[PDB]
């Protein structure tokens, strides 16, 4: 039993207050104001339409919904509609809006929630229960798995650590590239914002293991990828 996430938008709550104070006096009998608003508050305080709902939304989804609703609400108030005509249009409208919004939510859940396929993506969500906006950690396997690379001798080796979702992840730091030696030591060979490591004009000495670590504001890494390099003589 949860609020319609749309009320986490400030313009919506102000539109609704404006409806109460600016629209109701000229358009609905005074004896109905009290109960009308109770009914509207409750329309927004429970969202029954919801793939189990997790109670969260991204800013984009919230905006897509709020913009839809605000537009249609002002369409009602601009029309100057009154009395039972008004009452009926409004609740009718709200119902339809909730449905449309439901759709936007299911879309968000299946398409924009934790879209990473490995590693850990941090993403800001808004919790509908309390309008509180915080960062969620999207955890998929610890790994992102090995790359086989074979490079013709004396061409350039490019190791790409970038995954689709990185540009959208929040709280990321740096791409660390390590070479992994046969005696179980490692050398940090680069550490920076560049998602690829380029090594030009390669020879056999460049064969072996490399590991990429994409760092996070948190303790542990967001993405780990291992590369095994064979140099073709």
């Amino acid at each position: 039993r949860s609020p319609w996430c749309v009320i986490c938008d400030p313009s919506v709550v102000l539109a609704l207050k404006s409806l109460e104070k600016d629209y109701l006096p000229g358009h609905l009998d005074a004896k109905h104001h009290k109960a009308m608003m109770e009914r509207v508050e409750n329309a927004v305080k429970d969202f029954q339409e919801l793939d189990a709902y997790m109670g969260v939304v991204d800013e984009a989804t919230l905006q897509k919904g709020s913009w839809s609703l605000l537009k249609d609400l002002k369409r009602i108030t601009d029309s100057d509609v009154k009395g039972d005509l008004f009452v009926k249009e409004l609740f009718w409208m709200l119902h339809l809006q909730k449905e449309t919004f439901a759709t936007y939510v299911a879309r968000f859940q299946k398409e924009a929630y934790c879209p990473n396929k490995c590693g850990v993506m941090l993403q800001t969500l808004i919790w509908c229960k309390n309008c509180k906006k915080e960062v969620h950690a999207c955890r998929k396997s610890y790994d992102c798995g090995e790359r086989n690379v074979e490079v013709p001798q004396m061409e350039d080796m490019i190791l790409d650590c970038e995954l689709n979702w990185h540009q959208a992840s929040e709280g990321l730091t740096d791409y660390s590239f390590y070479r992994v030696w046969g005696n179980n030591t490692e050398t940090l060979v680069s550490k920076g914002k560049e998602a690829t490591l380029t090594k030009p004009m390669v020879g056999p000495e460049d064969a072996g293991s490399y590991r990429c670590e994409l760092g996070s504001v948190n303790s542990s890494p967001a993405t780990i990828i291992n590369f095994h390099v064979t140099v073709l003589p």
């Binding site: 039993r1 949860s2 709902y53 997790m54 109670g55 919790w127 229960k129 309390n130 915080e134 303790s219």
Partner: protein, 201 residues
């Protein structure tokens, strides 16, 4: 006299290391135990998973928790899985743990940060709808603030984990209650409680 039998050991449940020892790397919230742990790297990672394979108990049952709250629960797991200082409270049900005294701050903070999150039950140890492989709230169980179902910190500490923990009136650094998390920089404050309790003077 001194219960050394009861010190520096790991319980025999399915995931635990047979004996404690240091780890090169443990994930996030389990880092404080890397000095000497009953959890492997894998275990420490698994603890952070939504519906972690360790228990197949879903925390999302009333919707995703606030991250602050989720953090507390993960720490609870890290502690249970990683602590080498649990001997005095180990008992067989193949072993489990009963009424580990968690310091009041640990239960208070936990409770505080989970107030805004939602659950449907106050005794999580059983009575769930189990059909999907994961628990869902049973027919007609209302999703409401944690502060409704767990009116007190004590309720939360104790009942979520089937009385694995006891909310202690003792506070932190009394020498007589354990912390479910501690800053790794500052060194493990639970070692000496174990010792006290092994002897249990």
């Amino acid at each position: 006299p001194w219960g050394d039998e009861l010190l520096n050991i790991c319980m025999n449940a399915k995931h635990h290391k047979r004996v404690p020892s240091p780890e090169d790397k443990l994930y996030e919230e389990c880092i404080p135990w890397k000095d000497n742990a009953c959890c492997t790297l894998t275990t420490s990672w698994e603890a952070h998973l939504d519906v972690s394979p360790l228990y197949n108990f879903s925390l999302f049952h009333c919707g995703l928790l606030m991250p602050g709250c989720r953090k507390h629960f993960i720490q609870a797991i890290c502690f249970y899985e990683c602590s080498p200082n649990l001997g005095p409270w180990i008992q067989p049900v193949g072993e489990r743990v009963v009424n580990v005294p968690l310091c009041q701050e640990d239960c208070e903070e936990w409770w505080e940060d989970c107030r805004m999150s939602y659950t449907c039950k106050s005794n999580w140890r059983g009575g769930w709808d189990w059909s999907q492989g994961k628990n869902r709230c049973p027919k007609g169980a209302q999703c409401l603030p944690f502060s409704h179902y767990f009116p007190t910190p004590a309720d939360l500490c104790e009942k979520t984990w089937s009385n694995s923990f006891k909310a202690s009136p003792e506070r932190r650094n009394s020498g007589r209650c354990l912390q479910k998390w501690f800053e790794p920089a500052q060194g493990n404050p639970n070692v000496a409680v174990a010792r006290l309790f092994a002897s249990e003077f």
